[PDB]
């Protein structure tokens, strides 16, 4: 099936330590690896038009919705002024906790750092990360490999 | 059906709010046409404007209405051109004697406050005023006024200036005292 | 993008407006005060999302709030806002 | 800028003063003519009479000379010119204060401008509509002013303008009794000065050049005694062209046209241009919402002055 969490194979909590021992046996023999989550940041035409409107603050007869002008910002750390405006307009209406978690995790959104290491290093939880994945779906590229 | 008039200008029927007999369609090439239902019932269009509105009516399903009838006064309509200017076409009429034959009397051009406007609509105000709520290509909605342009500034033998507007009824006077 | 002026819904001097985003996804109900030229006169009331691709829109004059929204997939949605 | 509400239900098109300056007549798209008077005691514009005139939007009205009575002509889009004489034995604000005189049905086109001739040429009249035909009507019968006979019928345009294209036509007489009869006639983008020749027929005398777009208004400056005639022109461009006309086959005297000045201050379309009594103040209205007054200082070149926004 589609690769889900390991807890969906364990029937009960009494079987949990022996199933984790089975998982350790599988990993120690090279049978089973981990499927890590990698995140890259993507910007569509609406964010670009909003950034152009903000820049102006300081075809046309039709509106096709299947002709997006997308763009993938490969390394958001070394982004330019317009691209950092694209990143900071990706978070516009989100609450303050999402703003803080986006600010603390912006430099790791390059498609190379697995999110398990981001969870360990940045002392965040999985519910916060799944909140940020659900609240930002069309802007975040999801990359899954070992 | 009461009548079936064959024409290729059959897109975006808009009834005139001041006269139900007059409606207005356009076509795939952008040819706007103001019609009369009595002429079709009995059959030419009452007016026709070659390449006035956007094209691709048959190919594209998601089209911005760049033409609105005037809900502030009769014999007027506004068109959106290139997302920058709005042309308020004022029409004149004459009856060859009940059906009024239309012709274009004056066109007034108003520059938009912001560019890249896709669609717009009227906001009626008091004293026959006009404001235009406009939606940009990025989805931003803003409000823009229509300026009071003086139509006639006649002087006098007493050096008195009389000003007439293109929008409202009242007449301004600058006396000499 | 569609802007549709709505009459016979407000008993006050305000004029109701209906809007569709250029991506054809949401229906926003507005209320524009006619006598104030500021950008804050356009009051956002409610936004009804979860539309596929809106091809047409119409409203009912007699009953306040009743808005029909058509779609390219084939489903007409009749709903209420006010 | 004290405003007074005229009371029309639609767009007021043409407002004209009379000779004495104490009466204004306003025509509008509500098919009504309203005559207002200025009381010497109240010092406010009060309505004298309002009556329905035409079956379409009245777009041009003009007063006659006061030595011929109280006559108001009226041009509308229903291809008619109606003449209105005032009988003073009627009540004000009743609709019967101004009596109809004639209907000039000769025009096969919606008329745009009507101007009465100067009083030394008789009780003449001018017409110009969307058919390119300039028509002159004379009141040759002195007993009744109801038989206005067509005298001259020119052809300014070769073909009438199309149904969907906008057009503008303006007229301006020469108010000088010491010069031959002239008539500044504006086509779509052509400005023509006519003359009455020795054969009794109008002839093309001079053409004002330039005018890259539609001409909205033509105003001849009043002949105060200077040796040069001045014509002001408002165009669909931002140009206020002032022409200096100096006068010296089958014409009484030839005449030359020199473009004195050309101003782009309006950044729009100069909708109306008008002169003073002495031809010293030029009032121009444009799409910038501004009414500009113009005067000639230190030379013949016209310079701007007070700008009135609306």
From Swiss-Prot, chain A:
Belongs to the NPR3 family. Component of the SEA complex composed of at least IML1/SEA1, RTC1/SEA2, MTC5/SEA3, NPR2, NPR3, SEA4, SEC13 and SEH1. Forms a heterodimer with NPR2. It comes from Saccharomyces cerevisiae (strain ATCC 204508 / S288c) (Baker's yeast). The lineage of its organism: Eukaryota, Fungi, Dikarya, Ascomycota, Saccharomycotina. It is found in: Vacuole membrane. Component of the SEA complex which coats the vacuolar membrane and is involved in intracellular trafficking, autophagy, response to nitrogen starvation, and amino acid biogenesis. Mediates inactivation of the TORC1 complex in response to amino acid starvation. Required for meiotic nuclear division. The chain holds residues 918 to 1146 of 1146 of the full protein. It comes from the Eukaryota. This is Nitrogen permease regulator 3.
From Swiss-Prot, chain B:
It comes from the Eukaryota. WD repeats lie at residues 4-42. It is found in: Cytoplasm; Vacuole membrane. Belongs to the WD repeat mio family. Component of the SEA complex which coats the vacuolar membrane and is involved in intracellular trafficking, autophagy, response to nitrogen starvation, and amino acid biogenesis. Present with 184 molecules/cell in log phase SD medium. Component of the SEA complex composed of at least IML1/SEA1, RTC1/SEA2, MTC5/SEA3, NPR2, NPR3, SEA4, SEC13 and SEH1. This is SEH-associated protein 4. It comes from Saccharomyces cerevisiae (strain ATCC 204508 / S288c). The chain holds residues 232 to 429 of 1038 of the full protein.
Swiss-Prot record, chain D:
One of its GO terms (cellular component) is nuclear pore. Keywords: Membrane, mRNA transport, Nuclear pore complex, Nucleus, Phosphoprotein, Protein transport, Repeat, Translocation, Transport, Vacuole, WD repeat. The keyword Iron does not apply. The keyword Repeat applies. It is found in: Nucleus, Nuclear pore complex; Nucleus membrane; Vacuole membrane. Pfam families: WD40. Functions as a component of the nuclear pore complex (NPC). NPC components, collectively referred to as nucleoporins (NUPs), can play the role of both NPC structural components and of docking or interaction partners for transiently associated nuclear transport factors. Involved in nuclear poly(A)+ RNA export and NPC biogenesis. It is also required for normal nuclear morphology. Component of the SEA complex which coats the vacuolar membrane and is involved in intracellular trafficking, autophagy, response to nitrogen starvation, and amino acid biogenesis. Belongs to the WD repeat SEC13 family. Present with 952 molecules/cell in log phase SD medium. This is Nucleoporin SEH1. The lineage of its organism: Eukaryota, Fungi, Dikarya, Ascomycota, Saccharomycotina.
